[PDB]
Design a protein around this ligand. Structure first.
Ligand SMILES: [Mg+2]
Ligand SMILES: [Mg+2]
Ligand SMILES: [Mg+2]
Ligand SMILES: [Mg+2]
Ligand SMILES: [Mg+2]
Ligand SMILES: [Mg+2]
Ligand SMILES: [Mg+2]
Ligand SMILES: [Mg+2]
Ligand SMILES: [Mg+2]
Ligand SMILES: [Mg+2]
Ligand SMILES: [Mg+2]
Ligand SMILES: [Mg+2]
Ligand SMILES: [Mg+2]
Ligand SMILES: [Mg+2]
Ligand SMILES: [Mg+2]
Ligand SMILES: [Mg+2]
Ligand SMILES: [Mg+2]
Ligand SMILES: [Mg+2]
Ligand SMILES: [Mg+2]
Ligand SMILES: [Mg+2]
Ligand SMILES: [Mg+2]
Ligand SMILES: [Mg+2]
Ligand SMILES: [Mg+2]
Ligand SMILES: [Mg+2]
Ligand SMILES: [Mg+2]
Ligand SMILES: [Mg+2]
Ligand SMILES: [Mg+2]
Ligand SMILES: [Mg+2]
Ligand SMILES: [Mg+2]
Ligand SMILES: [Mg+2]
Ligand SMILES: [Mg+2]
Ligand SMILES: [Mg+2]
Ligand SMILES: [Mg+2]
Ligand SMILES: [Mg+2]
Ligand SMILES: [Mg+2]
Ligand SMILES: [Mg+2]
Ligand SMILES: [Mg+2]
Ligand SMILES: [Mg+2]
Ligand SMILES: [Mg+2]
Ligand SMILES: [Mg+2]
Ligand SMILES: [Mg+2]
Ligand SMILES: [Mg+2]
Ligand SMILES: [Mg+2]
Ligand SMILES: [Mg+2]
Ligand SMILES: [Mg+2]
Ligand SMILES: [Mg+2]
Ligand SMILES: [Mg+2]
Ligand SMILES: [Mg+2]
Ligand SMILES: [Mg+2]
Ligand SMILES: [Mg+2]
Ligand SMILES: [Mg+2]
Ligand SMILES: [Mg+2]
Ligand SMILES: [Mg+2]
Ligand SMILES: [Mg+2]
Ligand SMILES: [Mg+2]
Ligand SMILES: [Mg+2]
Ligand SMILES: [Mg+2]
Ligand SMILES: [Mg+2]
Ligand SMILES: [Mg+2]
Ligand SMILES: [Mg+2]
Ligand SMILES: [Mg+2]
Ligand SMILES: [Mg+2]
Ligand SMILES: [Mg+2]
Ligand SMILES: [Mg+2]
Ligand SMILES: [Mg+2]
Ligand SMILES: [Mg+2]
Ligand SMILES: [Mg+2]
Ligand SMILES: [Mg+2]
Ligand SMILES: [Mg+2]
Ligand SMILES: [Mg+2]
Ligand SMILES: [Mg+2]
Ligand SMILES: [Mg+2]
Ligand SMILES: [Mg+2]
Ligand SMILES: [Mg+2]
Ligand SMILES: [Mg+2]
Ligand SMILES: [Mg+2]
Ligand SMILES: [Mg+2]
Ligand SMILES: [Mg+2]
Ligand SMILES: [Mg+2]
Ligand SMILES: [Mg+2]
Ligand SMILES: [Mg+2]
Ligand SMILES: [Mg+2]
Ligand SMILES: [Mg+2]
Ligand SMILES: [Mg+2]
Ligand SMILES: [Mg+2]
Ligand SMILES: [Mg+2]
Ligand SMILES: [Mg+2]
Ligand SMILES: [Mg+2]
Ligand SMILES: [Mg+2]
Ligand SMILES: [Mg+2]
Ligand SMILES: [Mg+2]
Ligand SMILES: [Mg+2]
Ligand SMILES: [Mg+2]
Ligand SMILES: [Mg+2]
Ligand SMILES: [Mg+2]
Ligand SMILES: [Mg+2]
Lengths: 157, 124, 63, 145
RNA sequence: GGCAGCCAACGUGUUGGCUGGGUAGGGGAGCGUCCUGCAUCCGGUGAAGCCGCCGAGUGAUCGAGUGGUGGAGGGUGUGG
RNA sequence: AAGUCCAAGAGUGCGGCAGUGAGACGGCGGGGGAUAAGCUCCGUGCGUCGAGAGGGAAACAGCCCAGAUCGCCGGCUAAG
RNA sequence: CUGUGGGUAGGGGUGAAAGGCCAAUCAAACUCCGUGAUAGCUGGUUCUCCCCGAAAUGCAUUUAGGUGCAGCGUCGCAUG
RNA sequence: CGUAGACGGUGAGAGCCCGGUACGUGAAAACCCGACGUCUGUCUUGAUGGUGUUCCCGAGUAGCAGCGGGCCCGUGGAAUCUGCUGUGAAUCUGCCGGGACCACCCGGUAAGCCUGAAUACUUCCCAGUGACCGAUAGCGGAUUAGUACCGUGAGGGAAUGGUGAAAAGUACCCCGGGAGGGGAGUGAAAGAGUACCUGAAACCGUGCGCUUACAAUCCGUCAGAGCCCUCGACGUGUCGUGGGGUGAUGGCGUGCCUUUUGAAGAAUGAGCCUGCGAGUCAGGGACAUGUCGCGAGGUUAACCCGGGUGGGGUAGCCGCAGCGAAAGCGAGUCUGAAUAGGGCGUAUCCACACAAGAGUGUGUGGUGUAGUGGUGUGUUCUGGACCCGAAGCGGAGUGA
RNA sequence: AAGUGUUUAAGGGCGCAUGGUGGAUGCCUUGGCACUGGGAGCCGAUGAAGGACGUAGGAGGCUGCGAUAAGCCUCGGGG
């Protein structure tokens, strides 16, 4: 702003008699190099929607995917002990033809998330982290048995 | 998100300057003086578009009066007689008759005089 | 920052159960001997504040 | 299958901001302020009246005091016991909090407004005379804490 | 003959009737600029910018109509 | 008691957002002044200007006519 | 009279006194900071169109070119 | 190919061309960490609960007073804490506090000292990110930048980026003293030539078309002859649903903005162009109105667990009963001696009765009562708060 | 004889075509701005922070260094 830019303390010249506009400092907004008037300052943009709004949006998006048969459960992405983007890609291709998929996996299952992480349209998220934005991106949502059961059980009571 | 206001600013400038072609002086060169002139130009165009219908009626009346007086009748009596006769041609085409073919104008003056009171100054 | 209630107005104005703002009539604190009791008793109790002043009093009360 | 571009605010939700002082087509050269004065550049405080004695200074302060030792009670009317308890039974403070008839940690007094018909055993900090008569004339009993 | 605001009738988009000068000021609906989520499209067979031609819209303005110059990024939809 | 009544876009009540609180001349009733002022101060379901374009008064905010939605190379009128 | 070296500093200095002088400035020097001082005062405030549309009065005022409330505009609701 | 489709560069949009990325591997020395020993210290010529008195328990202190400071508390009835001055005790059936004070009860044990964690910040280093700026912006400083420069001095304080992919940066010839150019070459391009990407406007020329030297012009607008260009048709120059350019001539015509009762005004402001320059943001702020979720309920704050925007978190807050100064009472309550009027309150409506037409009341039934939390908009409060502008006031310094 | 009637451009205006000047616009960037996560939270008589003058085979500026002067030794890395 006007007071944060360097310099500007002096009145530039005498206030009367010079035949020029009355100017209070060289860092005034109308000056080149002067202060910005209503300019951006850092902002926190988060807004806190009620919990059940968020939960309902989750359920509505997941229902929207379910009505159209876009939810899949699988035992796991790839046979374990080692990641393999090739085989996991082939299996996921059998499972769906669309471009974007959510792959909801439990956090412990690292071999599975490693083997599907480098596919261009594939987004990997944890069941306890499920939100409406990622499921609305996905054309299909591909759960694991453990992750589907976990989401069901976190909302069964 | 800072914007450089020059893409949008130049559009009305080009519009007004293109409209101000032919203006003598700096009223065809500078956007501000050209805009000041465009204000007057469009008000004057409105004014004269409204008054053109009166200027042309003035011209038609003048031509009709001259032709009528050539036919030895006054303009006002001529149109009074044409109103009395039911012939309901407007002054525009009555002026085209006065100019283009004077024989039909002569005949129409004959009709107007035939359909006129035996005393135009009678108390009726 | 949270808004501040105008303290001088809170100790003068009050709200009823429905929400109308009541008042206390003036000219009754001293110099009472020459005032008849009819004037004295038409000047006490509460009375609802005027509709003209209801807009500013509300802003002073809520801050 | 709703995707992120299919999302739209509800009709009537979002109103356009009124950007002011952006030309004479809408609100220009004064931004809705009119000509000069105090109000043309700053404001006027809400407790200002032009130097005459303000509304908050020519009126007496309300009589009385506040009594910091006030005992306030959260009140239930007897008619709500009918709705809350279709059969009656024992009804204390905390199994009356669960029915959302009073706040959780407060003193509870029972008042006799509605009409009570069921056999109830009410326990509360205090009772009304009408409430006590309604409780005991309907067949139940009422004990204070 | 064209438009628009209020209202009415059948009825569910028309028709009809009234009305449409305007500063301070109030309300409503929009044009153009930039950044972005998502979706699509165009571009070294030449993007933007600029200069024109020929046009268009009730207004801000438009030209996924066209040429010249130019040399790497843009359009449109729906939200922010 | 009627009239207007697909309108006055009228009253009244509550609320959101106001601007205004320097007015001018002309007609009629008056105070001040010298029954002076293009003076000053009041009254007027008086007007116009302010905030009013168009026609008349040579020119000429406030006088007379008449209230501009746009177009027309139609007609009838008002003051004059 | 003059050179060289030095001393007096801001409500302070110095003045054979003119409010003179104290770095082209002096009824309280200059620089930076408080600080974007405060101004009932002047100036400026940026695209469009649609509908409606004032006031220049009353009352109070350390008041009279400022403001509060009333009157008079607009929008929403109620009544009709 | 992918545990690597991060991001750059390379002659234009590259996962497979380069550096890298995912993922692993590596430290002689120095430093920071732990861990095990020497080492260091203490405890054991010794433990435990009893039964009955004298002494001790932080002294120029507490307390008291005068004058102050600070507490929500501006001297107030003014406690608690505290400075200067004066006076000045007790060692536990003591002394201090519990908002003057006293009594009783309760809590504690001043005038001795150490103390980790949870908390605040970033000169500097490392690694990242941005609905951040993009050369009048962003730091004053993308380039000599606290530089040049201005001042005696404290101090003030600039302006200056872009050839091409690659210098391949124009050999040689010609005019010229050179500068500059013209051929020739380089290059995809020289409308890229180290005055170099794009190259707008103001401003300045040159060429052509129409016009203009008897004429009183806010410089336009409407009508308009003549000339010039262009598109069609018939044909071979004259019309046409035409289009442009210029305009002899005729009618009408008092710039823009501010501010004013009223300005073309001889009131203000503006030489011109290009770039810049003014209602913004924060807050469980307040009021109102949209919209959404849940609904007699609604919602969490700090915080905790999540490489995320997700999930837990009931403390509080608002609604749920009012009247009263208050004790209090409670669909009532206050006033009052009053079943005697009035005030406020009992969502709202419907009916049936019982009383008066002094404005309707009272009562029995029924219907049953709407809030809250996100978020858009308007206004508002606290903040520089729409932007610009004093003369001057204060603090610390610099100057004879 | 009376009457009528084109052609002037010293210079100026407007439209176009062509350039100059100028450095906007577009598209950029060895620069900044706001933060996030770590580290380290002091240096100095064993002479600090910061400088002056010197220093390369050749003139200056920035950087590095100090008469052992774009450097000297030892240990690692790497090529
Ligand atoms: Mg400053
Ligand atoms: Mg001057
Ligand atoms: Mg100042
Ligand atoms: Mg800046
Ligand atoms: Mg949460
Ligand atoms: Mg012309
Ligand atoms: Mg208070
Ligand atoms: Mg008294
Ligand atoms: Mg008395
Ligand atoms: Mg906002
Ligand atoms: Mg305006
Ligand atoms: Mg303006
Ligand atoms: Mg306003
Ligand atoms: Mg102004
Ligand atoms: Mg005024
Ligand atoms: Mg005002
Ligand atoms: Mg205040
Ligand atoms: Mg209609
Ligand atoms: Mg209108
Ligand atoms: Mg009209
Ligand atoms: Mg307006
Ligand atoms: Mg665009
Ligand atoms: Mg978009
Ligand atoms: Mg493509
Ligand atoms: Mg090419
Ligand atoms: Mg762009
Ligand atoms: Mg081309
Ligand atoms: Mg192009
Ligand atoms: Mg938008
Ligand atoms: Mg009528
Ligand atoms: Mg009407
Ligand atoms: Mg009305
Ligand atoms: Mg006044
Ligand atoms: Mg007045
Ligand atoms: Mg008057
Ligand atoms: Mg007068
Ligand atoms: Mg008179
Ligand atoms: Mg008089
Ligand atoms: Mg007069
Ligand atoms: Mg009068
Ligand atoms: Mg006015
Ligand atoms: Mg008029
Ligand atoms: Mg009028
Ligand atoms: Mg008359
Ligand atoms: Mg007639
Ligand atoms: Mg007449
Ligand atoms: Mg001497
Ligand atoms: Mg000296
Ligand atoms: Mg002196
Ligand atoms: Mg000086
Ligand atoms: Mg001097
Ligand atoms: Mg001084
Ligand atoms: Mg002074
Ligand atoms: Mg301050
Ligand atoms: Mg100011
Ligand atoms: Mg109107
Ligand atoms: Mg006073
Ligand atoms: Mg007012
Ligand atoms: Mg209103
Ligand atoms: Mg890449
Ligand atoms: Mg002790
Ligand atoms: Mg004190
Ligand atoms: Mg005290
Ligand atoms: Mg300590
Ligand atoms: Mg800069
Ligand atoms: Mg540039
Ligand atoms: Mg600068
Ligand atoms: Mg110097
Ligand atoms: Mg070649
Ligand atoms: Mg090229
Ligand atoms: Mg150049
Ligand atoms: Mg160039
Ligand atoms: Mg001539
Ligand atoms: Mg004349
Ligand atoms: Mg003319
Ligand atoms: Mg004229
Ligand atoms: Mg003035
Ligand atoms: Mg004025
Ligand atoms: Mg005047
Ligand atoms: Mg002037
Ligand atoms: Mg003049
Ligand atoms: Mg003036
Ligand atoms: Mg001037
Ligand atoms: Mg500027
Ligand atoms: Mg806010
Ligand atoms: Mg109360
Ligand atoms: Mg009494
Ligand atoms: Mg009562
Ligand atoms: Mg709701
Ligand atoms: Mg809201
Ligand atoms: Mg000072
Ligand atoms: Mg000195
Ligand atoms: Mg010529
Ligand atoms: Mg230390
Ligand atoms: Mg050096
Ligand atoms: Mg080695």
């Amino acid at each position: 702003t006007r007071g944060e830019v360097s310099g500007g303390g002096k009145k530039p010249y005498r206030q009367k008699g010079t035949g020029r506009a009355r100017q209070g400092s060289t860092r005034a907004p109308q000056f080149t190099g002067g202060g910005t008037v209503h300019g951006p300052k850092p902002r926190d943009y988060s807004q806190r929607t009620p919990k059940k709004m968020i939960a309902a949006a989750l359920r509505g998006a997941l229902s929207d995917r379910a009505r159209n048969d876009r939810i899949h459960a699988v035992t796991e992405l790839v046979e374990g002990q080692t990641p393999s983007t090739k085989s996991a890609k082939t299996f996921l291709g059998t499972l769906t033809e669309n471009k974007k998929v959510l792959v909801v996996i439990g956090r412990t299952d690292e071999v599975g998330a490693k083997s599907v992480r480098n596919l261009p349209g594939v987004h990997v998220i944890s069941p306890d982290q499920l939100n409406t934005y990622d499921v609305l991106n996905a054309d299909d949502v591909v759960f694991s048995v453990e992750a589907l059961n976990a989401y069901i059980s976190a909302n069964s009571k | 998100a800072r914007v450089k206001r020059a893409l949008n600013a130049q559009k009305k400038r080009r519009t007004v300057l293109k409209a101000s072609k032919g203006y003598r002086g700096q009223r065809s060169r500078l956007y501000r003086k050209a805009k000041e002139q465009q204000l007057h130009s469009l008000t004057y165009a409105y004014r004269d578009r409204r008054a053109r219908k009166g200027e042309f009626r003035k011209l038609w009346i003048s031509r009709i009066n001259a032709a009528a007086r050539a036919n030895d009748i006054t303009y006002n009596r001529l149109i009074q007689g044409l109103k009395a006769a039911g012939v309901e041609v407007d002054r525009k085409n009555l002026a085209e008759l006065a100019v283009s073919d004077p024989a039909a104008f002569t005949a129409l003056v004959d009709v107007a005089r035939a359909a006129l009171p035996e005393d135009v100054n009678a108390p009726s | 920052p949270k808004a501040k209630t105008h303290s001088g107005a809170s100790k003068r104005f009050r709200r009823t159960g429905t929400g109308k703002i009541v008042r206390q009539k003036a000219n009754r604190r001293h110099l009472l001997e020459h005032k008849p009791t009819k004037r004295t008793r038409r000047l006490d109790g509460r009375t609802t504040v005027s509709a003209a002043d209801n807009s500013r009093i509300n802003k002073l009360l809520n801050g | 299958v709703i995707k992120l571009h299919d999302l739209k605010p509800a009709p009537g939700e979002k109103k356009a901001k009124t950007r002011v002082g952006r030309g004479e087509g809408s609100k220009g050269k004064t931004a809705g302020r009119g000509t000069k004065g105090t109000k043309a550049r700053k404001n006027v405080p809400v407790m200002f009246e032009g130097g005459q004695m303000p509304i908050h200074m020519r009126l007496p302060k309300l009589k009385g005091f506040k009594n910091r030792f006030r005992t306030e009670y959260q009140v239930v009317n007897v008619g709500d016991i009918n709705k809350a308890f279709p059969q009656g039974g024992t009804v204390g403070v905390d199994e009356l909090v669960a029915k959302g008839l009073v706040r959780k940690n407060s003193l509870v007094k029972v008042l006799g407004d509605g009409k009570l018909t069921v056999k109830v055993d009410v326990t509360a900090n205090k009772f009304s005379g009408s409430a006590r008569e309604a409780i005991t004339a309907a067949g139940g009993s009422a004990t204070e804490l």
